[PDB]
Nucleic acid binder design. Sequence first.
RNA 1: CGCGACCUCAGAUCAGACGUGGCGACCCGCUGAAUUUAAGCAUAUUAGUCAGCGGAGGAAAAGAAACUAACCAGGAUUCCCUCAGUAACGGCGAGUGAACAGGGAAGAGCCCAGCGCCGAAUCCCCGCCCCGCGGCGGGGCGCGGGAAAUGUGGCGUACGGAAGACCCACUCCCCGGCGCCGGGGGGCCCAAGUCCUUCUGAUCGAGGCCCAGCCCGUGGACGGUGUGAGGCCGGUAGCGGCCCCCGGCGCGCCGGGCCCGGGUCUUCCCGGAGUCGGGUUGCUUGGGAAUGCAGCCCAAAGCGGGUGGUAAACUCCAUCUAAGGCUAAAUACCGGCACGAGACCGAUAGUCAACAAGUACCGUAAGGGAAAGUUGAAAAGAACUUUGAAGAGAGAGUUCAAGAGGGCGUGAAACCGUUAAGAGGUAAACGGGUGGGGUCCGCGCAGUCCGCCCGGAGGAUUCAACCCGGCGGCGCGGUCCGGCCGUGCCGGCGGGGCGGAUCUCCCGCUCCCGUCGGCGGGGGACCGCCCCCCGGCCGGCGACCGGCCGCCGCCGGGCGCAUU
RNA 2: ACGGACCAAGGAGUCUAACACGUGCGCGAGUCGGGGGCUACGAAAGCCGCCGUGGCGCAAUGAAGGUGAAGGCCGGCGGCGCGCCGCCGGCCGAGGUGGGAUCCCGAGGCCUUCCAGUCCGCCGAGGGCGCACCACCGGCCCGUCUCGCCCGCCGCGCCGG
RNA 3: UGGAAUGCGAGUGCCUAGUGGGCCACUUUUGGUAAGCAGAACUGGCGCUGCGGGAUGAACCGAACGCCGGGUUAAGGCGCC
RNA 4: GCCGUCGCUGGCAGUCGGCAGAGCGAGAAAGAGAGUGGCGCGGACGCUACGCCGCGACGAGUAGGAGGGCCGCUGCGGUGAGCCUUGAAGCCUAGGGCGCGGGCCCGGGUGGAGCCGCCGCAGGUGCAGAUCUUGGUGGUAGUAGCAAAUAUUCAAACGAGAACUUUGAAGGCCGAAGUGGAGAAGGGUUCCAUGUGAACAGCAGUUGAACAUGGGUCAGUCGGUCCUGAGAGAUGGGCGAG
RNA 5: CGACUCUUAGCGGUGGAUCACUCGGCUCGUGCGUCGAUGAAGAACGCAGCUAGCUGCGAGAAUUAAUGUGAAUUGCAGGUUGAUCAUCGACACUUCGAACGCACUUGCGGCCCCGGGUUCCUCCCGGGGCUACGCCUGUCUGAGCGUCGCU
Lengths: 134, 158, 259
Amino acid sequence: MKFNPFVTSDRSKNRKRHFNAPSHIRRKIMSSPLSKELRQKYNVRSMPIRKDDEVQVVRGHYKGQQIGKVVQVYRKKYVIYIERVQREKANGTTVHVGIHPSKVVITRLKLDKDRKKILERKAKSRQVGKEKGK
Amino acid sequence: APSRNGMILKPHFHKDWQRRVATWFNQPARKIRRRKARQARARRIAPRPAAGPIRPIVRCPTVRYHTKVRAGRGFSLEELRVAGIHKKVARTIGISVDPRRRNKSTESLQANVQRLKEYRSKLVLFPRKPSAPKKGDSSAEELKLATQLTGPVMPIRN
Amino acid sequence: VSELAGHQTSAESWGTGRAVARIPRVRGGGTHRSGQGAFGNMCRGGRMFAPTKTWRRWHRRVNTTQKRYAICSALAASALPALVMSKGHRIEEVPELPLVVEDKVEGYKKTKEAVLLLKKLKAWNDIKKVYASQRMRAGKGKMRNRRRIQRRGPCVIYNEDNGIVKAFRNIPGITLLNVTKLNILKLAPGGHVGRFCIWTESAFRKLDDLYGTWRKAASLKSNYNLPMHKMLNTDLSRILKSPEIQRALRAPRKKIHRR
RNA sequence: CGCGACCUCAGAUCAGACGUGGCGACCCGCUGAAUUUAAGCAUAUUAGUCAGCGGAGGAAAAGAAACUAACCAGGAUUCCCUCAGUAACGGCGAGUGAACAGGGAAGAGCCCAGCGCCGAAUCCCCGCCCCGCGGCGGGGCGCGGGAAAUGUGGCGUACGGAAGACCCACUCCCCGGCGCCGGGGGGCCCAAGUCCUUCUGAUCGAGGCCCAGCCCGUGGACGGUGUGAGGCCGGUAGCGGCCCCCGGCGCGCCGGGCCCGGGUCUUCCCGGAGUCGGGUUGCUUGGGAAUGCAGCCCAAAGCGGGUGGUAAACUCCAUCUAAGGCUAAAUACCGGCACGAGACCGAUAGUCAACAAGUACCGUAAGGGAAAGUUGAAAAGAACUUUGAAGAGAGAGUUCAAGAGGGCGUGAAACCGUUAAGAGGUAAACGGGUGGGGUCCGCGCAGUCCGCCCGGAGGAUUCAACCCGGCGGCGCGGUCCGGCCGUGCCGGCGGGGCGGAUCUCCCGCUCCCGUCGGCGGGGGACCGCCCCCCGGCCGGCGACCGGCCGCCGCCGGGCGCAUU
RNA sequence: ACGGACCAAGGAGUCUAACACGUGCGCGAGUCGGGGGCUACGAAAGCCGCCGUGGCGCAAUGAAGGUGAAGGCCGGCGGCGCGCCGCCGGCCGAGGUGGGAUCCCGAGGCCUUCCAGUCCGCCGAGGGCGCACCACCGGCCCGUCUCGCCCGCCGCGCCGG
RNA sequence: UGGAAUGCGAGUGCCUAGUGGGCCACUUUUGGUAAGCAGAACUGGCGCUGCGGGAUGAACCGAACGCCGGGUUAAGGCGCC
RNA sequence: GCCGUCGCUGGCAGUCGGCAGAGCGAGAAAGAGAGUGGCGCGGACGCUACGCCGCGACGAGUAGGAGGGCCGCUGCGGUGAGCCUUGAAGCCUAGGGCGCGGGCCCGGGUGGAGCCGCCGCAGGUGCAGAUCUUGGUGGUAGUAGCAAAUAUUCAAACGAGAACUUUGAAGGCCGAAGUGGAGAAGGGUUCCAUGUGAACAGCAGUUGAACAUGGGUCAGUCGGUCCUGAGAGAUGGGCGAG
RNA sequence: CGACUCUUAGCGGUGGAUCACUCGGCUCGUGCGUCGAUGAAGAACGCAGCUAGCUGCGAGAAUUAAUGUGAAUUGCAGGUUGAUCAUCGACACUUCGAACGCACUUGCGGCCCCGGGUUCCUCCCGGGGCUACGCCUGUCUGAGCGUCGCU
Ligand SMILES: [Mg+2]
Ligand SMILES: [Mg+2]
Ligand SMILES: [Mg+2]
Ligand SMILES: [Mg+2]
Ligand SMILES: [Mg+2]
Ligand SMILES: [Mg+2]
Ligand SMILES: [Mg+2]
Ligand SMILES: [Mg+2]
Ligand SMILES: [Mg+2]
Ligand SMILES: [Mg+2]
Ligand SMILES: [Mg+2]
Ligand SMILES: [Mg+2]
Ligand SMILES: [Mg+2]
Ligand SMILES: [Mg+2]
Ligand SMILES: [Mg+2]
Ligand SMILES: [Mg+2]
Ligand SMILES: [Mg+2]
Ligand SMILES: [Mg+2]
Ligand SMILES: [Mg+2]
Ligand SMILES: [Mg+2]
Ligand SMILES: [Mg+2]
Ligand SMILES: [Mg+2]
Ligand SMILES: [Mg+2]
Ligand SMILES: [Mg+2]
Ligand SMILES: [Mg+2]
Ligand SMILES: [Mg+2]
Ligand SMILES: [Mg+2]
Ligand SMILES: [Mg+2]
Ligand SMILES: [Mg+2]
Ligand SMILES: [Mg+2]
Ligand SMILES: [Mg+2]
Ligand SMILES: [Mg+2]
Ligand SMILES: [Mg+2]
Ligand SMILES: [Mg+2]
Ligand SMILES: [Mg+2]
Ligand SMILES: [Mg+2]
Ligand SMILES: [Mg+2]
Ligand SMILES: [Mg+2]
Ligand SMILES: [Mg+2]
Ligand SMILES: [Mg+2]
Ligand SMILES: [Mg+2]
Ligand SMILES: [Mg+2]
Ligand SMILES: [Mg+2]
Ligand SMILES: [Mg+2]
Ligand SMILES: [Mg+2]
Ligand SMILES: [Mg+2]
Ligand SMILES: [Mg+2]
Ligand SMILES: [Mg+2]
Ligand SMILES: [Mg+2]
Ligand SMILES: [Mg+2]
Ligand SMILES: [Mg+2]
Ligand SMILES: [Mg+2]
Ligand SMILES: [Mg+2]
Ligand SMILES: [Mg+2]
Ligand SMILES: [Mg+2]
Ligand SMILES: [Mg+2]
Ligand SMILES: [Mg+2]
Ligand SMILES: [Mg+2]
Ligand SMILES: [Mg+2]
Ligand SMILES: [Mg+2]
Ligand SMILES: [Mg+2]
Ligand SMILES: [Mg+2]
Ligand SMILES: [Mg+2]
Ligand SMILES: [Mg+2]
Ligand SMILES: [Mg+2]
Ligand SMILES: [Mg+2]
Ligand SMILES: [Mg+2]
Ligand SMILES: [Mg+2]
Ligand SMILES: [Mg+2]
Ligand SMILES: [Mg+2]
Ligand SMILES: [Mg+2]
Ligand SMILES: [Mg+2]
Ligand SMILES: [Mg+2]
Ligand SMILES: [Mg+2]
Ligand SMILES: [Mg+2]
Ligand SMILES: [Mg+2]
């Protein structure tokens, strides 16, 4: 259960805070787990996805072991678009099929300074939690 | 139209009573609020009693109740003059003082003077400056052993 | 329901003639709601019959002796073997039904150690029954923050809190109760008597200090004795086939005489 | 007549400030009805209510007795329980209707005028210097300007106060700045399966994870993700972590104000006026020979005045100090901001308004005021061919599904169209009883089985009785040994916790001359109940048993051999 | 005679207070924490007794001042005409009649070959203690009316019983 | 020797809805020319009640009613319907 | 014969089994009662005692009252190791049925995501009517009607399509107090061009004041602006609780 | 067998009932409890590349700066020394409106200072700061056959 009297445990209020979230909270919600190799290497469970990330699709029709680059992260429909994950329209044009980032694993990260800062901060908090558990 | 047999009755609902209906659903929240305010006062005055200053042995008026003994408003000026405590020193050392009371009886006068003599002995007065104590202050062994008294200080038992 | 619901609209009745049904209708206008019908429980919109008030008598008080009798009955039915299974608890592998455990149960602070204690006490079948009976609620309660429902599990009564609540609250089904603060709503869920309880040694010894026997009064309470039995030998079968009664009886007329 | 003061009254786009209006749920002051009831109605009642008006605050108001009581007296205000539907009011009808006291939440007290003492000892503004300057403050320098004797400041206010004399004992309280050490707001993060098979359009479904009973759990709330997820994600829990901002408790320093108390004796002083009160009138109240308020008239006094719930005279008492003012707290909040929850409602319901809702629209105006949610998981929103001018189609295509095709989830009834069947001059329709025809159902169409016995054909590693081990039941074992319990009783050179309206070395307090009497408390003795040790009976183990022994039954393994 | 084309949805004895009666539960001459205080669900629950204040009930009556719910018998003494009243010591000490469910006593007998003969049951003539309740007769307290006689003193009376 | 016959289990206490417009019929009878008129007394029906008969029918005659089979009647009928 | 009600407060704990002896329908107050002297291991059902079983009589009903509902709707506490994308609710059904009945359960289709049984609890809990409220749809009914102010005809063009559009010719009307040309109030883009024929113009339209794109109002002299009229309305003053 | 009419069933239309969903109400409880002449509430009019309504904003006009966040907004085009979002503390906030120069026509003024015009020489144009009523303290100018003092 939850013991904080300010955290909402209401369905309609949680759906409101979800579907009416501003973009910096949209980025926080739209996060994806890392692979086993990257998780062992960085000690980081999950990260928010970026435009220049590599993705294996885990669930759905387009799942497999195909490492595809993200086309762009569309936070309005809570979705990302992947390069080879696409389909053909009636007229013939290719349209990228939208995949939610919860069914998405990262095989390679695109590392900038802020990205390395977030990874080091999450690894530091994980080490503090491990030392408190020890 | 009344039926066969029953009490005559006068319901006082001929006014517009439904506008002024005091619902009592604030009650456990107000119990929590009184509890938090009382604990806040107890944490505010740290050596002092959480109840407050002492209150006199008081006979009741109005012949239904005069066998019972209450806790009154404050000590009388003649009581403070016999006990030898100034009325402005008494409010500072935690003694309820009111100037309205009289002293017709001698026994209740002597009882409140004796209760002042007991409270002056039971009082642990802390110094103003801890580095430089004064003449009329408590001892250093009493400084550590002094603590709060839960409930009414010297509860008056009939 | 709010008192302004239905009374914000101004609606005078059309009177008689007009061949209308003599209802207060909305005073004019070039819209759909004009001469429509506002007041009354039967009209669209408007008010309903008997608006529910804030000053309904929601709360019911019970006498203290009846509350204590309910607590004593809910505890006494937790020792009989048939009444616990008739509540529904899987208790086939439990070694003793008044399950009293050592005072090291308050010392636990880990849910893994609590699960291991339940495995060693062999009461884990009830918790696994709770896991199997976690299902969806039927009806409109899902959109009123009552989404998931499950079975109540074995209660655990502790005397002091030294981490036993932190160790046992995360396992679904177990409700924790203090000895002095026993609750009727948790000792008898749903008004059905005989929920399986798990006592510690100090909690099992503190009951005689709380309620006492029939010759020793309550030590913690002000004035409370045990309730009185209406009959002591409740086994009426042994009373009926006893040599005292069966001597002074007549012959049984068991021959069926039809027309 | 001129000049110079004072007093009244002007003019300023004079220098510096303030008020106006809004919201108005709660609060204060007015004003203030009629519906209704009295089965009519006029007093009453609705009702100091609705509407109207003015004024603030985060609370407002009230508030430290011109009090309650008559007792062994209580002691500011506010709020709750109770007083109490009581005293009392009322065509004494209908109906209305407190207060004291007791139990609580809270608890905090005070300041002026007067009377008097002090060289106006007082206050505001402007010029200069230092500090600080986003709540314009502190100190110094000005023969700078005003206010004020038609009275500013200090002592001092009903609890007495002031002055003088005599004794007792301290020398630390507050304001404005600088630095230092150790709850609130914001931001970023912290556990564990997307593990192997199997369904599905998609899994969050199902099975398993054995010997660390998959891994975490101070985290199995909730929400999203292609149905249903503790372990996919945001989060959840945690005296969990990191970085800023703010206030407070303290320490050290600087600039200041302040030269401050108590007891005894002596001498003085002390109070609020068109105010109280009386008559009359109107409203109001439970207040009734007038509770409160207001208008008019009369109009005070000082061992005085007010109150003492029946008007008045006399007489003693009891109790306060009116006609000046301040003050948190507990108390109220259908307005606003930030929140949390629900035995509520689920798009004719719930707010009028789940949606471009006080919107569209109507009325000159004040005002009135709707209807209206759902493709799919993802637009994947139907390319292209073909008839038509197009609306419309027919193929083809997407999707699990178009029998989901842009007002599209599910698609009822009333009503309409088509097909199939049956029928038809007493309008149609109905009840009872049959007959005939259709729709499917009985997956019917050589017809249900179950025990015992007889006879003929077959097959097992098998029947009864004995041996060993284990388990269970019973035992009036007439009365085995040993534990446990008793809503059963006793005995004690036994030890204890409670209760009592059973009695009587130590400590504290006051009165009287180390002593004698009084009060309270603590031991101490007495009784009732309970707990723990024993010793002995009774009863039970059939809400509550252990070991052998005796009988019976069951199970497992040995044999026993085919007229079982 | 009135309402009524047809169909779908909505639609009308609810809630609070007071009282009466009946039933269920707890305690019982007591009962009740409703207001207050202490210790996710939990705004729940548990606790308080020197927080039972207070409500109701255990006592009624009168307008009020007020008053306020069995008696009998023996002995001694005083007064008056064996009988009455008043004052002290011991005993019996909580009404009666009828109808009254149930319980108690048990004249007798309840059978296997005749008599004698103990114990367990069982039925009953007839006689009793009589639950509740009913009808009546009595008795006690209070307000009021009538007739008369005595007792007590801190204050002898327009006193009190 | 429960002091006539016959029949039947009785007594008693609360709470209490609806009703408080009636109508018709053998007999008696008021007012009125009379009325399917107005107003009474006894009793029964309708109201509240279906069923067989009176062709029809709130009151007439018979007879009152759970669902059925066999039989038998009442009141009425037995030319046809 | 069957259903229900009432009564007998009738009967059933006696299923007392090699720890055994199987009964108390019988006209007759009460015991298949204890004593003491003269081979084969066997026996149907039962009894949710709020249940089971047997006898008799009874059965109308308005207003009204009471009881039983394993009749029905919604939500809550328990419970069913409940159901469910290998198909929940809702809906349809010439199917199989059950119950006196309220209603309920299966078979087939549609549907795509939740739902139900039992013990209790709670209510905004059951419709055929109220000239009921909202929404929708019929007969009427392809019916009444598209009848006030004299009147249209021919050819050609655009166009898929012409009685109504456009042009030409003919015949008419308003007949200068007009059916003409211009203003005030009011309307507010209705003015003009281009394109469309989805909706409107009660037939149609290639047309329009409709729709969609675009444009259009140029002032010292024309008005407002200035003045004052009937009047309105500040300041002083008065009144007023405001 | 016809047409028309009635009943039942399959299907297809009018219609949106039922069911299931719900970024919404209703009720209860907690904390805060703050508007305005330094110009409130409200109203009007404008602001987007394509923008009617809603939302947001004010000629700096779907936003400026600062901080935090750390690669987007998106319907279509266009272009890490910080895009977008949130906080918002700095800056700015058109016209009415208590509304304030007098009226409400967007009309008419008055004073002072700047730039074209000038060569302070008056108009004209443009920009900026003032000009509402009442009231408090002080200042200045005053009035009075009000009360006085001196010649
Ligand atoms: Mg947390
Ligand atoms: Mg009545
Ligand atoms: Mg207190
Ligand atoms: Mg409504
Ligand atoms: Mg449902
Ligand atoms: Mg000025
Ligand atoms: Mg104001
Ligand atoms: Mg009336
Ligand atoms: Mg009336
Ligand atoms: Mg009238
Ligand atoms: Mg009044
Ligand atoms: Mg008002
Ligand atoms: Mg304010
Ligand atoms: Mg105040
Ligand atoms: Mg008072
Ligand atoms: Mg009372
Ligand atoms: Mg009268
Ligand atoms: Mg009144
Ligand atoms: Mg009081
Ligand atoms: Mg002075
Ligand atoms: Mg005073
Ligand atoms: Mg989910
Ligand atoms: Mg699984
Ligand atoms: Mg989940
Ligand atoms: Mg799992
Ligand atoms: Mg996680
Ligand atoms: Mg986490
Ligand atoms: Mg008045
Ligand atoms: Mg009045
Ligand atoms: Mg007097
Ligand atoms: Mg005063
Ligand atoms: Mg005062
Ligand atoms: Mg809560
Ligand atoms: Mg709707
Ligand atoms: Mg709708
Ligand atoms: Mg709907
Ligand atoms: Mg609505
Ligand atoms: Mg729909
Ligand atoms: Mg489908
Ligand atoms: Mg569909
Ligand atoms: Mg769907
Ligand atoms: Mg559909
Ligand atoms: Mg008529
Ligand atoms: Mg009528
Ligand atoms: Mg009609
Ligand atoms: Mg309905
Ligand atoms: Mg009654
Ligand atoms: Mg009762
Ligand atoms: Mg009537
Ligand atoms: Mg009558
Ligand atoms: Mg008549
Ligand atoms: Mg009858
Ligand atoms: Mg009849
Ligand atoms: Mg005839
Ligand atoms: Mg006859
Ligand atoms: Mg027959
Ligand atoms: Mg005939
Ligand atoms: Mg019958
Ligand atoms: Mg009947
Ligand atoms: Mg049908
Ligand atoms: Mg769905
Ligand atoms: Mg409801
Ligand atoms: Mg209907
Ligand atoms: Mg035609
Ligand atoms: Mg026609
Ligand atoms: Mg013209
Ligand atoms: Mg023209
Ligand atoms: Mg045109
Ligand atoms: Mg047309
Ligand atoms: Mg005027
Ligand atoms: Mg729908
Ligand atoms: Mg709708
Ligand atoms: Mg625009
Ligand atoms: Mg910026
Ligand atoms: Mg930035
Ligand atoms: Mg003008």
